[PDB]
Amino acid sequence: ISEFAPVDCKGQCTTPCEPLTACKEKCAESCETSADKKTCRRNCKKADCEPQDKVCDACRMKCHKACRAANCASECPKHEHKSDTCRACMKTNCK
Incomplete structure (x- = not known):
């Protein structure tokens, strides 16, 4: 595995959604x-x-940012405000 291709989030939320999923399942x-x-x-x-469930969202919430900061970086500076070039970057990058 190398630093390339788009990153996910949904799938990358098993640890934070480990107890949650188990909850849904058991249920x-x-x-x-x-x-x-x-x-x-x-x-x-x-x-x-x-x-x-909350812990889950958090993941989806963090990942969202983590991704941006990850994949994107130039399209989204430190402090922004719903940048177009960002939403466009994350849109493509953050599949």
């Missing part, structure tokens, strides 16, 4: 063919998947 099981799986799970997501 998914307990909510097998249950009336309104979604709802069920959703509620199960509140059981004790509130903080876990």
